Homo-oligomer: 278 residues x 3
């Protein structure tokens, strides 16, 4: 493999993160005060890293940080129950650990942390973060296993209730690549609805990484993936591979939902920068 690939992990990474009410009513995470996004920033680590997140709640309401998939002690699951949210103005230090796979003493095989995970609020609105997740307190987390191929870029599509990334219907987001780019999608669903994520012209493998190890990988290859609240998958595609450049739609294939605007564009450009048609 002469493509770039992930290194063995085991570093202790530190991070500042803020919850911030946005002028428009929404709430978002950010790494800097006043640079909050919906989705929140992508956090990426290698199997075996440890992440110390110094989380500061700049909001007038309790708020928390709860993560999927990664190892965390109960002090860091970010629930009101476990005395683990953060009161307004407060600052708490969450710790996410990750681990590689390997045999346990009993001879069984321990799964690693690798995957396409995500984080979100667990206290705003309700004791399950329905308000926070609605207002935009979610973001993607990627844990790489030593060897995973690394992309040219990662984009995060989040189906949150009837929106993509908390955007007005029929407003994307759109994305751009050039034919041949290795594009990584992190696809997260939040809210109370079920969806099917469809991408024109492209397909991935329905497994951990969206990529086939080689000729023996039995994983189904799909281009429509059903998805429900707190589901998260990811994949990599070669932009326009086998199909050329174009304005390739992605959308929820639920007919009412795409009709109601859950649609974006994967704009794959010719090397001259043009998109055929469009």
């Amino acid at each position: 493999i002469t493509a770039r690939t992930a290194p063995a992990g085991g570093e202790v990474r530190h991070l500042k993160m803020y919850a911030e009410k946005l002028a428009d009513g929404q709430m978002g995470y950010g790494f800097e005060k006043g640079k909050a996004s919906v989705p929140g920033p992508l956090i990426e680590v290698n199997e075996g890293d440890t992440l110390h997140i110094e989380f500061t709640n700049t909001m007038d309401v309790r708020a928390s940080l709860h993560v999927h998939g990664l190892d965390y002690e109960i002090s860091s699951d970010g629930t009101a129950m476990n005395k683990s949210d953060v009161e307004p103005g407060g600052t708490r230090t969450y710790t996410w650990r990750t681990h590689k796979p390997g045999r346990r003493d009993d001879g069984t095989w321990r799964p690693g942390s690798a995957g396409y995970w995500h984080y979100h609020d667990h206290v705003v609105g309700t004791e399950h973060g329905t308000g926070g997740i609605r207002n935009g307190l979610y973001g993607p987390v990627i844990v790489r296993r030593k060897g995973d191929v690394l992309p040219d870029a990662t984009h995060t599509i989040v189906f949150n209730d009837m929106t993509i990334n908390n955007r007005k219907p029929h407003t994307g987001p759109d994305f751009e690549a050039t034919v041949g780019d290795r594009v990584e999608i992190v696809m997260i669903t939040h809210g109370e609805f079920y969806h099917t994520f469809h991408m024109h012209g492209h397909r991935w493998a329905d497994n951990r990484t969206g990529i086939l190890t080689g000729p023996d990988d039995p994983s189904r290859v799909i281009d429509n993936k059903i998805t429900g609240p707190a589901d998260s998958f990811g994949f990599q595609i070669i932009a326009g591979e086998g199909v050329g450049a174009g304005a390739w739609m992605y959308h929820c294939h639920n007919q009412s939902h795409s009709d109601m605007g859950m649609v974006g564009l994967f704009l794959v450009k010719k090397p001259d920068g043009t998109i055929p048609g469009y």
Copy 2:
């Protein structure tokens, strides 16, 4: 493997296809004028084939042909956007290509086109084909990989909203096999609801082919599969294997939906043609 298996692909195939309003209000595809069906005809090819479809719209409205999974350029994705539908009376030539798997130059592994796919309209009713798909403009596409086991017969069950194959509730379809037949099911969902497809007395592997490579295939074996709009999967079973002949129901296991009528019969006969019970 003394069963029949798919040959290596690489042919160029031509096809005439028609969209047509049916006397009863629906719309269907067909290979011949006046011989249209809902679901539309099955297109089946081998990885590496190329398919040229001379599509002719015999309807008074714009209509298109959009396919999943297969390689196609943006001129053949059948969206209004990409100037790719077909106006009434018009005739466009869509091209779908397919490719085998193999190593890329970066050493990664490119997935092949093989799968259980489908094609449907993308412009009738809405810019997402909500009307076409509701009326019947959908059909199955099978792409086989060299060596795939070939069935004795394929059948197509489509859960389109609260119907099976656009049939009035509580009216099938029913299918027939003799015990021991290798039956292939192609299972497509369309519309705005989510379903679970259940078959009595039979089970398959939740992977690309519904069939386990052999002793090492980790794929889960299931008899109930959740399924959302534009989801498509397929499998093969041995009719009555281990259970003998009978009127074996298949249905959406959603309790309200099977109540409202999404039920059919897999009628597996003894050699004498009789169904125990029934």
Copy 3:
């Protein structure tokens, strides 16, 4: 592998089961009169066993026993249609067989019975057991393959409409383990809704067993699984592995559904019996 593992099967097992109206209006299955439970008792067998269930309906209404996944002749599919339910006061003898995987004469590979399955009523309320299932006529079935790891304990969570195990919202069930226990979960959905089962602090493999065979298993590793009516999966976890003890929430991650009360606790204790927090 120095953990306990399932033996090769092939025994002929016998069983008495009862359907029982419960004082509070529900219906339950049991192994003894007056000892019925919702969910019903867990039947567990090895690939190759045969199970003869002497089912006795003690209710004023027709009721049946229909099983997923296992081999059964149409005489024992428990549908009104195939004259296979049981009249009030009646006693039928259902038979479920299971088989191991192996090569067929055509050289294809026949799947084994192994899996996380379930049984439920098929005639109470409607011709599809909608009333039976609503009232609690469902229970889990585990078919083990020779070699499967055996757990320290199994627990069954059933999402039946807006309830867990037919319990009043916000009332568990809760379970307890001690850090390090090998806990098996059998997860079944019933009714008319779709769900996502999430579990704090833990993760399993989305395959047949929830466990990775070793370093080549491509199976996604998840902590949130979408689940529809009559869907059934299972897994094992090491209680608090990598995360220590705590009141570990599990719930439907559907924001409205967990809000409405589909929540339980996985109470993982230290040897003290103490739960940090709680």
